[PDB]
Amino acid sequence: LPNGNYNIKSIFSGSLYLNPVSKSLTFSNESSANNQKWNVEYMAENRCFKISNVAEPNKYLSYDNFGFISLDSLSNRCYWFPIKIAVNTYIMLSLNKVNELDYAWDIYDTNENILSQPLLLLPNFDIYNSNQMFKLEKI
Amino acid sequence: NSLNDKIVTISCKADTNLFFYQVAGNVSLFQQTRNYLERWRLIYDSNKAAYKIKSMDIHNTNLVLTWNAPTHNISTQQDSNADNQYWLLLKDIGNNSFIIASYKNPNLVLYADTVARNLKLSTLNNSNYIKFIIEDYIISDLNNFTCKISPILDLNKVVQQVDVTNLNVNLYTWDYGRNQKWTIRYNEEKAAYQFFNTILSNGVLTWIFSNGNTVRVSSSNDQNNDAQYWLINPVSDTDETYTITNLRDTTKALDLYGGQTANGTAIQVFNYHGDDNQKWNIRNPP
Amino acid sequence: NSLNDKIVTISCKADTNLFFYQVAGNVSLFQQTRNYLERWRLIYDSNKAAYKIKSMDIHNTNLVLTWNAPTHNISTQQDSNADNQYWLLLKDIGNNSFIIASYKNPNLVLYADTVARNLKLSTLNNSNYIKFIIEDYIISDLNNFTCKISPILDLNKVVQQVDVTNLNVNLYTWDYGRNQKWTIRYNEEKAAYQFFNTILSNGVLTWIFSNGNTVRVSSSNDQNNDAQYWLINPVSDTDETYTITNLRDTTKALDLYGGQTANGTAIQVFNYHGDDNQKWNIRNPP
Amino acid sequence: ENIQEINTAISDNYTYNIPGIVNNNPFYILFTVNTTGIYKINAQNNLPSLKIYEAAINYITGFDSPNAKSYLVVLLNKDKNYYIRVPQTSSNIENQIQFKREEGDLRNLMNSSVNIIDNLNSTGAHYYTRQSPDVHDYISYEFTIPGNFNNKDTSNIRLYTSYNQGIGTLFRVTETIDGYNLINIQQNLHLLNNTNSIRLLNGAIYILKVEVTELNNYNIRLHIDITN
């Protein structure tokens, strides 16, 4: 996964884009703004990726003590371990085991509708959970 | 078809002195008010198997507990019957507490932020911060309430025990005496209340069916007497007014002898009639 | 603790014909067997406020439902009282079903894969795949069970209705007729059962209390007669033997007249003493 | 045919730049590995395809089809020598040969060339002709099912051979920062005139590893017919 700026999308929708809304992360209508742009940087020492918001470049995708993905300053919670499962489809694990499991970005859907859902961090067991699949589109 | 349409208070297992409190669209956690600001009607939708939680606010009558998805915030918004306004009420058996999960995303449940005094969300875990006590508002208001009890025919009079040794019960003018105050206790098992007189450690208001129609207080370490127990029913469209019916014989309401607003008038039971010497004001002693 | 030590079956809200079934450490979803392979003892720990779900397997006596962390798989493993062997039983009120959450990680709950016919852990959603029916195993076994009923004094004879027009109930040699078969139905509200004779549509075993100790079949569109309803209590050490007591007066037990075993012998009610003529085998019709 | 040499024994990672002045001729690279292990070897964009030889000199794997994309996955012993035949770059852009030690699932692919298939844009018939490995030797194919991926949309894939009999193993491919992950989804697939279809996810990547069990033709021709 090359370094650079990406849009981030759920496989449930090709027209909804990851952005912060208050302290949550959600997928929204295309804005063409910096807040839908994500700077992916590989970290050689731990073989993971940190992912910062272009609009707020000192804030990274992280997670809180409540099960939500968040946008925070750098910490070991900001390291993501992706599993590429298709062209530019990924499962995004936290680098750290959480509650001694793999945990992954997870977006809840109601009949494939994700509007207004917050992105959460939930257990991962395999590569087939649709709610854990995300598109990284270079742009 | 058990909680549906019930008006309840909701308090925190992590802090039983904090209740869900609503003012102008804002939901917080606040001490007990015994008024509509902390009352909620549970409105069941049978096809969703989930509930709307609706504020009994007398000014804005259409506000329901709402998750402001995708944020961490909970507020009250106009009822639009939206998924973010429905909640699964999951009773944790053995614990007698509830988890309250969002219908819109059942992985997320209410979390009591007791330091911030407001509501948040969390995935499920074992902490007390996601457990809640849901109680019929009358029980909630009266349980462990220390009150004074007045006939509506003379508010300045009061049901009293006579003294620490004379365990008889008569009417007398309010003088703030401990013999004139009652700590109400709800017994979840018998689904009824007892009135503990505060001049005794274990003296409770007891219908002495033996001498027919009369009422004294006596020891509460007599264990299985269902005349030591009472039912309290709100007189319709009041705030403080109730009927008090005895457990052993629910036709037998607590009665002010003859309607006589006078000192020393006997307190007894009589057959129910909805008639004014059988209505009572239960209030905080000023 | 109202569930502590209870023996239950657990079936799928998604497919009520599928039950949790255990053999040699494997948990699967299987059709009803009415035997120990589908029975589980709920074991409460008050400190954790969570339950072990212990298989009633007769050979391996210490197997409990276990989450195979970090995978999403479930199995039965030896009981070591581990957090991954404890479960929160969360009753979804109004839906009469349970969500069963891992105590080790309540983010995850049991999910029924009805096409692989096994269980896994899953995050929450609003589907019936995460909802289960937990039922006392006797109610589970007998509810909607079409049976024949025999006195233990002679298992070759059955309690029968005489014929379609003759509503009397007597003892006769088993001949496979529908007047000799009964469909048991549990009434949720009454917490009691009826026995519908299969030769009729709405005819139930009834104590004719206005005629002393007589029992006959009569119609079940007589609606509030407790005399139409029965308690069915297992006899210890036995798989098929029950005492059957009348809901109107539980001291009245289904009774074989005299303990006589001849064809035609009366079936009646009598004061309960637990003699052999008040014990009944409820069995599959061969 | 100028033989060049990587004098230093390579380990884990190595990149060798084609001079460019040797592109007008088939040319060889002599090398050895620091430690015995399974290596992925390829040109810059898997182009051109490479051949590898053991040094007696013995052909191991690889072929020579012009404009055919491929990479080699081979078990290399630190005791022996190895030759890489690079074919004619009839286009004077400078190429690079990449050597990488594989510690993960790609080890399932030794020893074989993996053909990059990139013309599966639709339903219908497709086939691919390469020089056939001898009996018990392997040839692999990495392809992507046409369509957009949604973990639901799916196509019927008929995989078969024309003349040679072969046993196929089908893998599902995912990728992390550490290279490929492989899920072995099918085994023992008899390819010669196989009439069984397989439903595979649209937009997903798969690898078919084929073991030649009967050499009836100098070439092996793999058919991937797609229906919906």
From TrEMBL, chain A:
- Mind telling me which Pfam families this protein's record contains? Botulinum_HA-17 (PF05588)
Entries under CDD domains matching the protein: beta-trefoil_Ricin_HA17
Q: Which Gene3D superfamilies match?
A: 2.80.10.50
- Taxonomically, the superkingdom here is Bacteria
Name this polypeptide is given = HA-17
Q: Which organism is it from?
A: Clostridium botulinum
Automatic annotation (TrEMBL), chains B, C:
Q: Which SUPFAM superfamilies match?
A: Ricin B-like lectins (SSF50370)
- The domain of life is Bacteria
Q: In which residues is beta-D-galactose bound?
A: D255, G258, Q268, N277
Give every Ricin B lectin domain span: 4-135, 146-283
User: What protein is this chain from?
Assistant: HA-33
Organism for this UniProt entry? Clostridium botulinum
UniProtKB/TrEMBL annotation, chain D:
- Superkingdom of this entry's organism? Bacteria
Q: Which residues form the Hemagglutinin component HA-70 C-terminal domain?
A: 95-228
**Coiled-coil stretches noted in the UniProt entry, renumbered to this chain:** none
Q: What is this protein called?
A: HA-70
Task: Supply the source organism for this entry.
Answer: Clostridium botulinum
